[PDB]
Structures are given as C-alpha cells and as structure tokens.
C-alpha cells in the first residue's frame, strides 16, 4: 500500500516549480496526489554495495608440506635453508644436542633450521566499503486504475538524477543516503557461501594468520603452525586443526548481509533512510491529513532485535481509520515521557486490517515500548545491552 503526502510535505511557488520533501524507507511506498492527474508513487527499491574492495584474508585452515631440515654439527657454523627467504614458508631456527651418536665429532649445541611450506586451504575475506559508492535505486510509477515504471539509479557521489513523468513533466530528484551501520567501523566478512557485517577491530584482533588484499605473504602463521622440540636431527611441524567452528561461533552475535542472486557481488542492505527533495515544475498537488489511531491494535510481530541496536515491531490496525500509529518509549508506565527515538518516519496504516512495520531505538537498559494511547495501548518491556564490538 502507498501513503499519501501531507500539505507541509510539498510547497508550490508563485513562480518556478513545486518541491516535494519526502523521507524514503525500504519497502515503504509514498504517493504524490495531483488533482485531475494520476497519483505518482515513489518507493525506495534497494540500497546496495557493489564490488567492495577485499582488504584482508584470514586463514582458518592451513596445509603444510613435509619438513625440510638443514642441520650442522658444533663448530661448523649456522645451518641455513634457501627456503628461509621465501615468505610462504614456515621456518624456525633453534639448536639441537649433537655428539658422537648422531655424526658429530665433538659434543654441544648444533645449529638447526626447519621450514615447511604454508598454504591456506580455507580463508575468510574482509571487504572495505566505499561510502562514496553506496548505491540506492528509486522507483516511480504512475498509479494504475502511460503508467510505465521509471527506475532511477543513484550512488552517494551522484545524488542528483533526472526523470520525466506523464502530466507532471520533467523531474529532478536530489537524494541522500543514511546507512543504518557505520561502514567506516565495519567490514563485510565473507566466510563460506555465507556473509556478515563485522566490526573492523574485532577482525584485526583475531588470532589467525592474515593476508593483505594487496597480496603478499601470509603473516603470523604461528597461530596455525607449531614447531616441536628438536631431537638431535629432526623437528616436527604440526598444522593446528581447522578453526572454522571457533570462527563461526564468534560470528553468532553479528548481523548478516545477503548477496543478490544474480549480481552475486551486490551486498544489498535493508536499513537506511533516503532523504529526497523531488523538484517539479509548477502544479497544484493534493494533500492528505491523518488522524491519530484511537482503537485497539495488536502486535503481529513482537518487538525484535534487528542487529544494529534498533527494534522492529509489526502492529495491526484492524478498526480505526487511515491513521498514524502513536509510538513512544518510556522509562516507566506512569509519565509516558518519551526517552527513546522513533526511527520509522510516519507510521501510517493506510487501510484497516493493515500491518505496519515500526522501528524504534530504546534507551540503554530497561524501558517500556508503548504503542497507542490511553488504556487500549500495547505495552512491551525491553532490555538493551552494552553493545560490544564482537563475540
């Protein structure tokens, strides 16, 4: 269903054109009504990240070759292997007890070096998000009842795009993005076929070998490679067991991303408000008023955590009217003095028996989610935790 704009949402000038100022959320439509002309629908289709740069790989399962060992007797110098200079080898130097029993003339410590080639069987990719290339697509079709669909393609840097509509004429949309998470503090972690949004610092502090997105050598191999004590001519090297399970566990408290089925590198987001100023030539537009809902509502989906500190609920308005759903978040049931923040812009049930999504930002700690007003109001208690960076 589509929601009509109010009078204050647009402004018609004596000379020039009429500007519409709408805040667009995902999967919520907003319609523009003009007398003797079809209503114009405007909806945010998607917010996506296209081709993020891989900034780091994290190994969680390694494979070694056999152990190459050069060893020298006492008073014969240092034992060197030419593999010590290859960066993809796991090398270690030490001294082993030598003597007559193992082919050395005099007793004492003999130099010894062991190297084993390090390959990464399975790695986790960490992607960098360029916020100047966050895409957002806006659709605009004339109401059906030349009703073709106009799809405009945006990206943070290019925020001004043009279009034309029947009757309304040429249009200019000047839009902005506000992401739901800070991609300056976050990576896109891609382990198997799955993917997540993880914090940057949580990812650098992992005790696993890592490799730059630019390439190079696998650094800090010692998290998966272990060198046993020597026995006079030999050193055992062990690749520590696969660590996918330990990594998949630490990603439990991390929100997920979904690749597009076709593009397969489009990481399309869900949260995010697109603030557009629609610019049109001069024409009178139709407004719409909304009374506040005054009848009993019900939680279709009880308030749930979204992954980025906000709570989503889905209430049903079966009776009242095309109406605005009053939502506040308070410390106590007494004052009804709001302490939270209403993320959702204009929670409006267009028709009766409709189900409306509502996003809210409770204060940290205990609070009460209040939907409605008076005595036929929904009261849901909430708890909010300290928002660690991981684990």
């Amino acid at each position, epitope marked *: 269903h589509c929601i009509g704009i109010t009078d204050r949402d647009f402004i018609e000038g004596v000379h020039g054109g009429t500007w519409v100022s709408a805040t667009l959320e995902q999967d919520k439509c907003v319609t523009v009504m003009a007398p003797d002309k079809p209503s114009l629908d405007i909806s945010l289709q998607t917010v996506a990240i296209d081709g993020p740069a891989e900034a780091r790989k994290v190994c969680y399962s390694a*494979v*070694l*070759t*056999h152990v*190459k*060992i*050069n*060893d*020298k007797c006492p008073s014969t110098g240092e*034992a*060197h*292997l*030419a*593999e010590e200079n*290859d960066g993809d080898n796991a090398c270690k130097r030490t001294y082993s007890d030598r003597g007559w029993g*193992n*082919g050395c003339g005099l007793f004492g410590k003999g130099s010894i070096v062991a190297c084993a*080639k390090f*390959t990464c*069987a399975k790695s986790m990719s960490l992607f960098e998000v360029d916020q100047t290339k966050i895409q957002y697509v806006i659709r605009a079709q004339l109401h059906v009842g030349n009703t073709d669909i106009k799809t405009l393609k945006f990206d943070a840097l290019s925020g001004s795009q043009e279009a034309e509509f029947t009757g309304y004429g040429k249009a200019t949309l000047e839009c902005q993005v506000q992401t739901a998470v800070d991609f300056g503090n976050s990576y896109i972690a891609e382990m198997e076929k799955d993917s997540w949004i993880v914090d940057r610092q949580w990812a650098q502090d992992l005790t696993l070998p890592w490799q730059s997105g630019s390439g190079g050598i696998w650094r800090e191999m010692h998290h998966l490679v272990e060198f046993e004590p020597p026995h006079a*001519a*030999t050193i055992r090297v062990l690749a520590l067991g696969n660590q996918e399970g330990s990594l998949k566990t630490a990603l439990t408290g991390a929100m997920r991303v979904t690749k597009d089925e076709n593009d397969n590198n489009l990481y399309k987001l869900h949260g995010g408000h697109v603030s557009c100023r629609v610019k049109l030539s001069a024409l009178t537009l139709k407004g719409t008023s909304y009374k506040m809902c005054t009848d009993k509502m019900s939680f279709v989906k009880n308030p749930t955590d979204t992954g980025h500190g906000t709570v989503v609920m889905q209430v049903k308005v079966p009776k009242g009217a095309p109406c605005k759903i009053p939502v506040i978040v308070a410390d106590d049931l007494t004052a009804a003095v709001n302490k939270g923040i209403l993320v959702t812009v204009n929670p409006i049930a267009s028709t009766n028996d409709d189900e409306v999504l509502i996003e809210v930002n409770p204060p940290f700690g205990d609070s009460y989610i209040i939907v409605g007003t008076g005595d036929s109001r929904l009261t849901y208690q909430w708890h909010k935790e300290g928002s660690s960076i991981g684990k």
Partner: antibody
Amino acid sequence: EVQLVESGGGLVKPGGSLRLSCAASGFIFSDYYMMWIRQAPGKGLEWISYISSSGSQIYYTESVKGRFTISRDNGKNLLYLQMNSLRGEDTALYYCATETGWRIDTWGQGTLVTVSS
Amino acid sequence: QAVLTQPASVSGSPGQSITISCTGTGSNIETYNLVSWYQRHPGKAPKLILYEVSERPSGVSNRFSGSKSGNTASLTISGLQAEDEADYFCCSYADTNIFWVFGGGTHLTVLG
C-alpha cells in the same frame, strides 16, 4: 653455471650390484636436498631416493627400500646411489637432481642402466 | 604407465600457439598448487621452465605460459620456434607421503 654430472651407469646382470655417482658444481652442495629419479621403459618419471642437505633425512620408494642406498659427500660435492639386487624393473635412465622450494630444480644429463639376464 | 596424464604427441607449425595438458586427479594437484614443467632435449638435462603453476625461472622465454583449472595443469607455447622441439614433463607435489608424481611425457614436434 650450476651443473650435475651422472656417471657409473652401464650394463649388468640381475642380482648384481651397481653404484651411481653425481658430481655437483656451481652451488653450495651442503645446503640443498638432492634426489635420484629414473625413467623406466614405457613408464613415467619416478623419484626413488631423496636425501637431505646434511644426509640426516632419507626417503625411499617401496620398490627400492631394501635394495638401494643413497648417500652424499658434502665435502667432495658427490651424491651417491648404491644399487644392489638389481632386477629387470630397475632398467631405466637415472637422473640426479636438486630439490629446492618443494620442486625438482636442476637435473643432470642422466646415465643409462640396463639389466639383461 | 603414469599417475599424471599428458598427451603422448603434440605437434605444431612455427609461429603457432600450442598447448600441452597435464591432467591429474583429486588430492594430486588441487591441494598444494605447486606444479612444475620441465623441458628435455634428447641427451641433455631436463630444464625447469615453469614452477608454482604460472611462475617462470630466469631465462625462460615469455612464450612459455602456465595455468591450471581443477585437475588439468596446462603448458602453453606461443610463437613456436624450432628449438622448442623436446619432451615436456609434469610434476606435482601430491601429498606428504608420496611427495612428487610425474607425467608420462609429451613429444613436441615443430614441423619444418
């Protein structure tokens, strides 16, 4: 530059003994692993003996584990292969090669070992 | 005959681009990604022309290229010269027990 030279191949009867020698130059012999490789008639190449830089680690294939014995003289830049209990299956072109980086690097011209009863 | 499989005979005219394949099995080439290619003129020593799939030692011409997809490692020679006529071999570090397995060899012919 780097060179390996095989010698000691020839003709011998089954059950007999033969010793292969491989002289190296152009690199530090005591720093690199060396190995013996043979190419049997109608078969692919096959490493049969593998020795470490100091001679402390020895590896053999099952076909030769009891019969062949590989050694090296890092003072004389010589790699040896003592072949005992020679059979018909052991007739092949025999190579000595260096192994650095988990790949066989430099080879020798090879010496021919024929066994006919 | 062998464990790695390469065609017995391949031939090409001078200037042509010729590709020699080396088909391995699973747990023969897919794990370590270190595959070597050798060239042997008759009576001479085999010369390493490719190692680590795509890497080329010093002095090996840019005509020789290396690639791999799944089981099949491939050697490709472009600008085929007369000198390239030799036997080409294929080595792969299979596992920690057998270490290296070789290809049967491939006779390359330059039609003059």
